[PDB]
From a paper:
We have characterized a glycoside hydrolase 5 ([name]) domain of a bi-catalytic [name]-GH6 multi-domain enzyme from the unusual gill endosymbiont [name] of the wood-digesting shipworm Psiloteredo megotara. The enzyme is part of a large multi-domain cellulase comprised of a N-terminal [name] domain, followed by three CBM10 domains separated by serine-rich linker region and a C-terminal GH6 domain. The results showed that TwCel5 is an endo-β-1,4-glucanase with a catalytic properties that renders it a potentially attractive industrial biocatalyst for cellulose bioconversion. Furthermore, products generated from enzymatic hydrolytic of PASC by HPAEC-PAD analysis revealed cellobiose as predominant product with lesser amount of glucose, and cellotriose, as is commonly observed for cellulases. In summary, the observed activities, product distribution, and cleavage patterns strongly indicate that TwCel5 is a β-(1,4)-endo-glucanase with a mode of action resembling that of other known [name] enzymes.
To gain structural insights for TwCel5CAT, bond cleavage pattern and mode of action, we solved and determined the tertiary structure of the catalytic module. TwCel5CAT was crystallized in an apo form and a dataset diffracting to 1.0 Å resolution was collected. The crystal structure of the [name] catalytic domain was solved to 1.0 Å resolution and revealed a substrate binding cleft extension containing a putative + 3 subsite, which is uncommon in this enzyme family. Consistent with the defining family member, TwCel5CAT exhibits a classical (β/α)8-barrel fold (also known as TIM-barrel) with two conserved glutamates; Glu157 & Glu245 in the catalytic center that are positioned to promote the expected displacement mechanism characteristic of family 5 cellulases. Thus, from homology to other GH family 5 cellulases, the proton donor is expected to be Glu157, and the nucleophile is Glu228. Furthermore, substrate binding cleft of TwCel5CAT is similar to other clade 2 [name] enzymes, showing conserved aromatic and polar amino acids involved in substrate binding. In contrast to most other GH5s subfamily 2, TwCel5CAT has a tryptophan (Trp226) in the outer region of the reducing end subsites. Of the 15 unique structures from GH5s subfamily 2, only three have a Trp in this position, namely the thermostable GsCelA from Geobacillus sp. 70PC53, the halotolerant Cel5R cloned from a soil metagenome and Cel5B from C. hutchinsonii, respectively. Of note, a comparison of the Alphafold2 model of TwCel5CAT with the X-ray crystallographic structure showed RMSD for Cα-carbons of only 0.35 Å. Furthermore, the side chains of the amino acids in the conserved active site and substrate binding cleft were modelled close to flawlessly.
Author numbering: 25 to 321
Write the structure that this text describes.
Amino acid sequence: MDVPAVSVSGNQVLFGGQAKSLAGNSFFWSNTGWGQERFYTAETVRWLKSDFKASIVRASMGVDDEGGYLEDASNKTRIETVVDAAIAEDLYVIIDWHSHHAEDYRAESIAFFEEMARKYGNNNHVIYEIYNEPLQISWSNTIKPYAEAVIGAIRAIDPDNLIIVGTPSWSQDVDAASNDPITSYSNIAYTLHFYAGTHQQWLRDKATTAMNNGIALFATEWGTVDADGDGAVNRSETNAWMDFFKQNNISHANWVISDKAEGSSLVNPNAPVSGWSSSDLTESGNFVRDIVRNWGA
Ligand SMILES: [K+]
Ligand SMILES: [Mg+2]
Ligand SMILES: [Mg+2]
């Protein structure tokens, strides 16, 4: 095994037994026709590894909207392209069921994650993210029962690899999850998402409570801009979050590898799929490249 195994002990996600924070980058919605398919390539993964010094990539598979996995198996193929490349490159890779409604498609999630666990669960690289961003729904009554069903299905095949579970309110309410944690399975962490224009110390305080209640967090998506993925790059608030992640050994992936005309995109419209120069990178992209490159200092 050429990368260390990911596990959880108390409020820390460990890599080969070590508490630390790793950094990387999320792909956009995989959905056919949404414009960002062209970045789901081995070339792009290699460039993130070499030039961003990324440790993690996140493959964000659309599920239930037009063009998503429920309608079009090509979404899975794009995920596989990135997973295979991450394994070959000795990067961690998150397989993200990129839904806001996963409780409505429990059987389909189970079947997908069983397939992924069969294909990939003996690789230490692979991490499962079973529910991107629940909405304003109950942790105990809606998310938790979905999550226990999917986790049990994964764990029957793949006993060890990390599973990360979304939390209420766009993966903000990690404190609610921490009040009724998933104790019946090992190596479970919980999702925290922030955007620097929208979520400030109040959300850090909720995350701090969650960790001090005993659960481990993984910041599988965050942006430099506003929560809608557009707006001004907010350096000072981004940097306050980065300091909080480094202090608390929380790993993270930035939104997003995309050339869509919105502030969160790493690259300008029509940029090449890899090899990005500073003119190819957006204001966010240039700043994120510096954060991820220097993360290991
Ligand atoms: K657990
Ligand atoms: Mg395994
Ligand atoms: Mg604001």
